[PDB]
Write a protein that binds this ligand. Structure first.
Ligand SMILES: C[N+]1(CCCS(=O)(=O)[O-])CCCCC1
Length: 253
C-alpha cells in the first residue's frame, strides 16, 4: 500500500484495503463524490500547480480540497494505478447542450480502466454529473442518483467516443478520443481552463458536491441545496462564504 493509497482511503473515509477489486470501484466512486467536491478556487486564487501525483496528493488528499476534471480524474487515475489496475487518461471536450455548442477544446480529462479484457470509463470529475460507477464501453446504461449514463462509439469533431446522459432524453455530455494521453495533456487542459476566455471556470467561484440525499452548489452569490423533491436557493454574502465552504464542502483556503 503506497502513501497515495493510504491518504486516499483516509480522504474518502472508507476502509483501507491491500487488495482493491473491480466490484469495489463503484463504492469508492460514491465515497469520492461524497467527500471531494468539484471546485475551481485555485484558478481564482491563482495558486494552481502542475498536475502531478504529488501536487494532487497534497492539494486533494492532504489539504482536503477538491478540484476540476483535470485534477479529480487524474487523482483517481493514480489511486487506481497504485491499486494494480490497468488505467489510462484520455482527453476530450465537453458539450454545452443548453446552448448547443462545444465548450473549450480539450478541456476535459478522464480515466479509462481495463478489466477482464473490457473497457470502462472511470468518471469522477464531470461536475455533479457523476455515474458513481464505471461506465462500460459495451454500451450498457449506468443508473445513478445523478442521472443515466452510457457510452457510444461515435465520431464527432471532438473525439471518437461519447458519454451520453439523461436526468429527459439522451444528451451529449462530452466527446473524447480513446487514444491515451499523459499528465502533459492534463496540464494543457488546466492551462486551457485557466486561460481561455470562454472557459466556464475562470470567472466566478463554482463549488458543487453530491450529498447523502442530493447535492449542494455554491457560487459568489448563492447556495443551492437539492434534496429529494426539494430545492433551496439562497443568497450568500462574503461573510458567510468561508463558513459555507468549510461546513458544506470541507474547503478551507
Ligand atoms: C451531435 N452533436 C450533439 C447534439 C446534442 S444532444 O443534446 O442532442 O445530444 C451535435 C453537433 C455535432 C456533434 C454533437
Amino acid at each position: 500500500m503506497t502513501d497515495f493509497q493510504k491518504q486516499f482511503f483516509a480522504r474518502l473515509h472508507i476502509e483501507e484495503k491491500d487488495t482493491v477489486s473491480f466490484e469495489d470501484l463503484s463504492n469508492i466512486m460514491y465515497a469520492m463524490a461524497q467527500t471531494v467536491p468539484f471546485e475551481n478556487l485555485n484558478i481564482l486564487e491563482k495558486n494552481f500547480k502542475e498536475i502531478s501525483k504529488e501536487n494532487l496528493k497534497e492539494k486533494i488528499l492532504v489539504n482536503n480540497r477538491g478540484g476540476l476534471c483535470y485534477e479529480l480524474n487524474p487523482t483517481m487515475y493514480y489511486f487506481l494505478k497504485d491499486s494494480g489496475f490497468d488505467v489510462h487518461l484520455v482527453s476530450g471536450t465537453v458539450y454545452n447542450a443548453a446552448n448547443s455548442i462545444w465548450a473549450v477544446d480539450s478541456g476535459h480529462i478522464a480515466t479509462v480502466l481495463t478489466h477482464h479484457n473490457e473497457l470502462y470509463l472511470i468518471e469522477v470529475g464531470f461536475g455533479s454529473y457523476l455515474p458513481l460507477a464505471p461506465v462500460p464501453f459495451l454500451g450498457e446504461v449506468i443508473h445513478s442518483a445523478t442521472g443515466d449514463y452510457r457510452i457510444r462509439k461515435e465520431m464527432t469533431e471532438k473525439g471518437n467516443y461519447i458519454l451520453e446522459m439523461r436526468k429527459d432524453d439522451w444528451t451529449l455530455g462530452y466527446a473524447f478520443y480513446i487514444e491515451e494521453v499523459d499528465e502533459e495533456k492534463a496540464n494543457t487542459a488546466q492551462k486551457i481552463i485557466v486561460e481561455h476566455e470562454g472557459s466556464p471556470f475562470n470567472k466566478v467561484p463554482l463549488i458543487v458536491k453530491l450529498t447523502e440525499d442530493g447535492h449542494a452548489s455554491l457560487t459568489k452569490d448563492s447556495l443551492t441545496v437539492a434534496k429529494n423533491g426539494k430545492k433551496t436557493k439562497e443568497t450568500v454574502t462574503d461573510m458567510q462564504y468561508t463558513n459555507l465552504l468549510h461546513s458544506k464542502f470541507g474547503i478551507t483556503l
